[PDB]
Design a protein around this ligand. Structure first.
Ligand code: FES
Ligand code: FES
Ligand code: FES
Ligand code: FES
Ligand code: FES
Ligand code: FES
Ligand code: FE2
Ligand code: FE2
Ligand code: FE2
Lengths: 106, 389, 389, 389, 105, 104
């Protein structure tokens, strides 16, 4: 579970979001900012919203519930009412394949 | 229709129409009183969706006219002057209207006026069902009453009894409190729990995916639009509340199973089945009066095959159900609604609320209401529609 | 100036200034109390056109000062301190003003202050006439009091007796109700009509052109501005009210003919002659106190050639006219005014009202008031005029 | 910011922050009650700087939590439910918080909820000193209490006794009235003057230049910021009040010399020494509750070396000082503050006031407060800080 | 059947002309460009004379409350008006403008 | 009679200088461009020093409440000021600034 198979870097266009469901664990969200990939918990820290259903503006994801937002790279809140940082998960591409860590950084 | 700061509506992308519907939804039927409260030839006043209305019974049939003279905007009810069976005359300058179509048919102070027969006072459809008076606060020919009622309310054998009162909170706070799965917690000491040996958990530990938490009804043959709370289908009911691992509270371990089927329907009526008894049902409307108040129209249904059974039911209603349930159980819902007023009063609560799992049910309702309401009531509807080109 | 939504003022092109005059017209005389209500050396407080004022009687003469200290804006009246016959000292820091010109002549807490003799508290002209106290709520040299009073009120032989009280409605609603030809309808059951055998129709069926419905007086020998209601000159009195052809109400078939001479004058005083008896006259002011209240200053006049008749008149007034007419008749006008508050409260009634023929009198007044008022009182006049660059 | 019309703030360039601080200054310590008023496990509600707070004493220590559930924003105090010694459980859906750090540690309605352990209710530092409860209404680690207390209040031997109440006026009007040199005039008839043989002038004739009128303290090592009123150093006290040169009022010629050392300190606490007796001191706070009210936290300090002395002082406080000074002298300050409400209520008084010489002290305070306050409390702080990417 | 109003010359485009009728309520004639139209003069919302209003294109605005109507169809164009205006047939036979005594059905 | 205030060059354009007079109210000398004007220094609406205010063209804005006066006529230019300022004619002889001892 260290590295989770997401998809081919080819399956994602710049500025898109993908939800990664995990057995017995909370979902993750993978964002493609250009040719780089990032990932955080999928659930907004302000409620029960799914960030994968939000709007990505550059490196900032906006929650579809209340307009709160986070920086997808650091997981830090970017817009109120969000105040709790998101857990960030490492993403690496091996053989044009996208992988996300099973455990968050720290 | 701009009832709230645009900045806030822009933030709540999932249910903006709902957040904007501070005055309620127009073009829906709403219960405002019981048939026995309105007698022949005795006009009664009330405010619905911010509009002052007058209801009268003529030859047994109900009629509804807006309680505001077309001339100088006074309420006709200040001094009711029904001079002929089919009309009402304004006490000020005697402009006279017909109850059936609102037409200005006479003006006692000037029978030659060019306004006679050319102006029309607003009328609203009125329909009685199950001893309840429903008013269609909308324009054009009304849809079937069943569209705006929960399933079974209009069943032939369903005996409907209840009470109605005015509560100080916006109608939406009442609705959400009612459909809120986890708010059961505030009823843990209700007398109905012990006095009716109810089984009542403290909460619910969710199970399954988001979609499984509810059943959204937007394909009902009757046109009904609503949501079913299915939290108890995959979850695990909480009967031992703990803090730090230590049990600090327990749910009710009675035998009577109740409220295992809860649903909310537009324009805002909740159905709880079975309740308060395994063989009864509860139907309650949270009717908008103005932005700060609503009618808490409570009704209890129990099948009855004959007048004999209808009395037994009525007696238990008066001596047990109404006292122990409608009040003994639901009174805590009243101050709970009132407790949320401050947080949402400035419309900021719609942005700052921090929801948890069981609110998935509330979200479903907000989305359903936002997508299937028949119109947003506005202050302009109250004062007089405004438009240009 | 700038008291109502600019979008509303834009719509009412016929009388925008009038609709804007929420707080009344500045630079006009207004009666506020009776001479006997203020004694020598006993300051009295009141609010006029939204301004708190103090009136005192020194050596028999009345003086008026704004009841707001120049220093920290407190009302001097909270604790009156008249330390010398000709001055009043603020209870806070002892700034002392002269009643005669409002000049800050002393400051007990600092006799060396550079402010002394360098500031002036606002003063307003005050004149007593017919036992009534009039204040010129305006700036600069006042015009003759006659300009702002109905014809004959100041007649040497005219004996004036009256009553005053505060009514909860904007002054304009009071003015319009008083000058409203068709509002007579609300008086159909008055005790005065029966107890004084008055002839009173339910209303009037207008006759002739609209130009003939009123007579506007743009200038009297004293600059008076007003409008006479002439609906009865070519109009047909309505004594039988019918609905669908059937008679449902009748007017009063008394012998005494009264109120066939009705006129409204700026700043807002009605003259009804003769009333409530063929040998009497009624003059009533609707004085703006604030945007929600006004003084309903009622007076009844009767020519008297000597102390005997005056004494007799005062006896009839207290025993009959005051309770039967001023109260028994006019009380219905009070609640009628209050009934129009909601419709005009949001300023929307000025756009949504649906007028009919007899309202030509009101329209004439609104236009006259809009074209000849001497100034619009604004909230800035109340807090302190403001202007930048 | 966003508390006052920008147009007004632009006009008061010398103290805009002060004029904008209608809700008070954030990030300062404020006394809100006396220690003996908050008992073990007996939560108390209060509103400070517009925020609803809950205070509780557990194992003798005080803890402060915002009285607003993070879930649906209701006050936890509507129905306090402290299921365990170290927690409080919202009565609505049972979200449970720890008094010690506000962490959401449990949720009785959903033990599996993902919110558990990932949300935190706002907490504020609380400290007891001299029998007074101080709350640091601010963010981050608080500074030493000493910074927000006037000199000597925290002295080892200073015995503090007091009284607290809610007064209907903005806190700034209270601060200015207290530091106002000339307001002494309102106390000329206080029972304390005669009953305690006080020498009390009616006011002062300033002397010297502006800078000599006060001593701005911004160099204090403990960090306290304030201003000393030195008007009496070069100014002549007024004992003979005159109008037109004639004596109309004299000051008190008592033997006891008091209040010759007056200072105001941020966040808004006045120090009058010696008062009400030559061997005592008075320290009073005007704590902001909301825009229209404040706590008038009065304390009288007197050196005591043992229980016998402090017990004697307490008896004297209850029998004389409280009724004769705190009430007999200061009650006039209360209605004086209230009298200024109307003028400043619309924020216009901050522009229209006409100041005189002694107000130099108030101006100094306004400038000090504007420059050294630790933050402007805003409505956003009350409802929830807002920031858009 | 018809009434002589005035010569098409007397009316500049964008102007209104009140036509009084003995024994009947007044009418209003509007010139929108080079075409003429007629309706009741009295606003259906009260007692205002539309001839004293402001014409903007084919829309006449009432001087009392700002309500408005399309002078061609007589249909309300702006609130508070809700009752359609009575329209009358107009004819310009030989530079002379004529108005029908009754509203066009 | 006349009082020597200072050398014209002692004042930069758009600046104000307070002139104290023993046994009299201080005056304010303003330099608008290359022109000089003088008025009483104390705002007529309070105790503010106009010399500590903001000069905008020929108008001085009081530092206290934003009231203002035309330094040439002394008449109020902005509320809340209502009492006209005392104006003193100024003389610039040989790059030297002198102001009348009495208002006029
Ligand atoms: S749930 Fe995401 S901002 Fe509120
Ligand atoms: S307000 Fe009803 S008839 Fe005039
Ligand atoms: S408020 Fe009147 S002298 Fe100070
Ligand atoms: S509002 Fe407190 S737990 Fe829901
Ligand atoms: S009378 Fe024409 S818009 Fe009202
Ligand atoms: S002291 Fe100058 S504007 Fe007020
Ligand atoms: Fe409930
Ligand atoms: Fe009347
Ligand atoms: Fe005091």
């Amino acid at each position: 579970q260290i590295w989770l198979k997401v998809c081919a870097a080819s399956d994602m266009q710049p500025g898109t979001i993908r939800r990664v469901n995990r057995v017995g664990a909370a979902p993750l969200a993978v964002y493609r900012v250009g040719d780089q990939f990032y990932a955080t918990e999928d659930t907004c820290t302000h409620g029960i919203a799914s960030l994968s259903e939000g709007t990505l503006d550059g490196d900032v994801i906006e929650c579809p519930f209340h307009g709160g937002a986070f920086n997808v790279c650091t997981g830090m809140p970017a817009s109120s009412p969000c105040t709790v940082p998101l857990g960030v998960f490492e993403v690496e591409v091996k053989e044009g394949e996208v992988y996300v860590a099973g455990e968050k950084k720290l | 229709m701009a009832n709230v700061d645009e900045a806030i509506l822009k933030r709540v992308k999932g249910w903006a129409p709902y957040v904007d519907a501070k005055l309620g939804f127009r073009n829906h039927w709403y219960p405002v009183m019981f048939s026995k409260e309105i007698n022949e030839g005795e006009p009664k006043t009330l405010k619905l969706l911010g509009e002052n209305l007058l209801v009268n019974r003529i030859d047994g049939k109900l009629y509804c006219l807006k309680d505001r003279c077309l001339h100088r905007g006074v309420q006709l009810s200040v001094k009711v002057e029904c001079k002929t069976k089919s009309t009402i005359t304004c006490w000020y300058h005697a402009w006279t209207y017909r109850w059936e179509d609102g037409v200005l048919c006479d003006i006692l102070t000037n029978p030659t006026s060019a306004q006679i027969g050319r102006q029309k006072l607003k009328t609203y459809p009125v329909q009685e069902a199950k001893g309840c008076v429903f008013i269609y606060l909308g324009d054009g020919d009304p849809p079937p009453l069943a569209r705006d009622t929960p399933p079974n309310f209009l069943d032939d054998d369903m005996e409907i009894l209840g009470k109605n009162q005015i509560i100080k909170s916006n109608w939406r706070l009442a609705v959400e409190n009612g459909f809120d799965p986890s708010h059961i917690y505030i009823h843990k000491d209700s007398i109905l729990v012990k006095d009716n040996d109810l089984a009542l958990p403290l909460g619910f530990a969710p199970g399954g995916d988001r979609k499984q938490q509810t059943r959204v009804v937007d394909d009902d043959v009757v046109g009904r639009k609503g949501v079913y709370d299915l939290i108890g289908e995959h979850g695990v009911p909480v009967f031992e509340g703990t803090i730090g691992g230590e049990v600090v509270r327990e749910g009710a371990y009675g035998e009577k199973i109740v409220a295992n089927d809860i649903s909310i329907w537009l324009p805002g009526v909740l159905k709880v089945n079975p309740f308060p008894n395994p063989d009864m049902m509860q139907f309650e409307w949270y009717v908008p009066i103005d932005e700060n108040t609503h009618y808490y129209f409570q009704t209890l249904g129990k099948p009855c095959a004959n007048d004999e059974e209808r009395k037994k039911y009525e007696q238990e209603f008066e001596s047990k159900w109404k006292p122990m349930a409608l009040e003994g159980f639901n009174n805590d819902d009243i101050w709970a609604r009132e407790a949320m007023v401050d947080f949402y009063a400035d419309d900021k609560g719609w942005v700052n609320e921090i929801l948890f799992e069981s609110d998935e049910a509330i979200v479903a309702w907000r989305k359903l209401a936002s997508e299937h309401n028949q119109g947003i009531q506005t202050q302009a509807h109250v004062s007089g529609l405004e438009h240009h080109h």
